[PDB]
Design a protein around this ligand. Structure first.
Ligand SMILES: OC[C@H]1O[C@@H](O[C@H]2[C@H](O)[C@@H](O)[C@H](O[C@H]3[C@H](O)[C@@H](O)[C@H](O[C@H]4[C@H](O)[C@@H](O)[C@H](O)O[C@@H]4CO)O[C@@H]3CO)O[C@@H]2CO)[C@H](O)[C@@H](O)[C@@H]1O
Length: 512
């Protein structure tokens, strides 16, 4: 099996995150135990492969044999079979065991490695006779051991798998370096002597963009795009063109919410993975992309981008993706720029009704610049929010959808809060009427000094981090308890919104 064969068979992939990998068991985190029909839903979307992370920890019995709980093994087989019966290529692994107990390798190798061997022999034996579309991944983000120990661990677990024989003699086995890190793979890793292995790494760069840390709310400079390619090209050069298939076991955004950047990031990364013959598997923890309960994608466009790009089909990208019009403003013609990426604009629709080229909109000769006429905009537009959506269709690749959003100045019922340090318990709710605007990022500054509220954590910036420090929910703004606990004296928080330049300033007073 060549790297090209694996790409053709597996790209694009999707992770069943925070499910069988949850702790202590399936359903312990934000997703319930997976329903069979979720795999039908992922099939409907067009993914060719799924990764099923599994944390075995609480289901492993005592020394010396470490028997895996029978009901758990039955459940993992049930879920694995559901995926396989939908003709997916399927990745089965050992997941959060990596830090729950495997990272004891450094301090206690002989006991830990013995235990891991007995665990993998049990997994290998149960799944020995499954079709070749099932792949084994030795361990997720391995840590707490040397590079030498990592290479030993890969070799020993692979030997155990091979030794069970039958189809496990030829089954694809996925290995990587420390922490599934790309640089470890390139510099400390050595491939086991085996001609049926696949190499892996995870990719989440830039971390502060994908996680919306420190106010890094956009992505896509020429340098950023160049740096993304230069990141992964050496893996192609050292391994792929030497015949090693490669799986990017996880990639994707982790809270970043700006549409244009998110779409551009996914199209760019997946196209680069495809170019260099690496299978991209999308990280979905159940909150960020596919809504399993509603059985719908929270961002259908970014999903369609991954589906097309993962098949080697470039997607056109429009800017802006969100058009903000302020209540009362004078209306003029609106320019939308299109990064065609080889594609051809075939129309612009509202619902399934087409706009008229000439009177509703015009295009330049290149076909990459669209002017939506003011009179058309006026018709599409008194309550704030998304008033209309324009769907740009292309001959090939995903459609682009532009929200036309009416907004007005956000209003807060209360913009000053007093907190007692001894009485802190849970997040601070800041009721708001955002009037069509959306939360982008937040910074926090100590009034008397002008220094960051979180200076003891991040010295160089006042900007806070999405989710761990702040969030928006049901139209209200929140500061996490974490932030409140760092407050020493009166501070000012700036909630920066979309559209760029609109913000809401909140003062927080501190008492004992
Ligand atoms: O625990 C009860 C409580 O759980 C809540 O669910 C939380 C979990 O508590 C929390 O541990 C979990 O954090 C996940 C995160 O969502 C994943 O995106 C992340 O994925 C990792 C991946 O596993 C690694 O292989 C990879 O390389 O890095 C990515 C990204 O970091 O893994 C972490 C766990 O380590 O998130 C859950 C949802 O917020 C419930 O919501 C709550 O109701 C429960 O009371």
């Amino acid at each position: 099996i060549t790297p090209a064969d694996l790409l053709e068979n597996m790209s694009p992939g999707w992770n069943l995150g925070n499910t069988l990998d949850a702790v202590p068991t399936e359903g312990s985190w934000n997703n319930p135990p997976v329903r069979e029909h979720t795999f039908d839903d992922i099939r409907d979307a067009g993914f060719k492969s799924v990764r099923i992370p599994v944390t075995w920890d609480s289901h492993i019995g005592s020394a010396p044999e470490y028997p895996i709980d029978t009901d758990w093994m039955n459940r993992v087989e049930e879920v694995t079979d559901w995926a396989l019966e939908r003709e997916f290529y399927v990745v089965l692994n050992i997941h959060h065991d990596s830090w729950l107990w495997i990272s004891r390798m450094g301090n206690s190798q002989q006991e830990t490695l013995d235990k891991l061997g007995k665990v993998w022999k049990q997994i290998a034996e149960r799944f020995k006779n499954k079709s070749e579309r099932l792949l084994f991944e030795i361990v997720n983000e391995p840590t707490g051991m040397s590079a030498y120990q990592m290479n030993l661990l890969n070799r020993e677990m692979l030997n155990i798998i091979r030794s069970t024989g039958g189809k496990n003699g030829q089954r694809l086995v996925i290995v990587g370096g420390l922490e599934d890190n790309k640089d470890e793979l390139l510099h400390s890793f050595e491939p086991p002597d085996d001609d049926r292995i696949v190499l892996t790494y995870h990719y989440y760069s830039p971390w502060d963009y994908v996680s919306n840390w420190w106010g890094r709310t956009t992505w896509g400079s020429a340098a950023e795009i160049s740096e993304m390619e230069e990141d992964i090209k050496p893996v192609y050069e050292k391994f792929v063109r030497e015949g090693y298939p490669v799986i990017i076991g996880e990639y994707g955004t982790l809270g970043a919410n700006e549409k244009h950047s998110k779409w551009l990031y996914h199209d760019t990364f997946v196209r680069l993975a495809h170019k260099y013959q690496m299978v991209p598997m999308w990280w979905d923890n159940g909150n960020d992309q596919f809504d399993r309960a509603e059985r719908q994608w929270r961002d259908p466009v970014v999903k369609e981008i991954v589906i097309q790009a993962g098949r080697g089909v470039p997607n056109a990208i429009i800017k802006p993706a969100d058009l903000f019009i302020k209540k009362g403003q004078s209306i003029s013609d609106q320019t939308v720029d299109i990064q065609l990426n080889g594609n051809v604009l075939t129309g612009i629709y509202q619902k399934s009704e087409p706009l008229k080229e000439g009177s509703d909109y015009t295009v330049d000769n290149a076909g990459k610049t669209v002017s939506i006429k003011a009179s058309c905009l006026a018709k599409l537009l008194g309550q704030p929010g998304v008033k209309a959506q324009l769907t740009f269709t292309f001959h090939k690749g995903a459609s682009q959808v532009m929200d036309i959003i009416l907004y007005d100045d956000p209003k807060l019922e209360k913009s000053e809060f007093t907190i007692s340090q001894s009485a802190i318990s849970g997040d601070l709710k800041i009721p708001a009427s955002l009037n069509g605007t959306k939360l982008a990022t937040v910074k926090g500054v100590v009034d008397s000094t002008g220094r960051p509220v979180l200076e003891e954590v991040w010295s160089w910036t006042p900007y806070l981090n999405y989710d761990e420090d702040f969030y928006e929910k049901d139209g209200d703004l929140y500061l996490k308890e974490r932030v409140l606990k760092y407050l020493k004296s009166d501070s000012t928080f700036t909630f920066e919104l979309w559209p760029k330049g609109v913000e809401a300033v909140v003062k927080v007073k501190i008492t004992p």
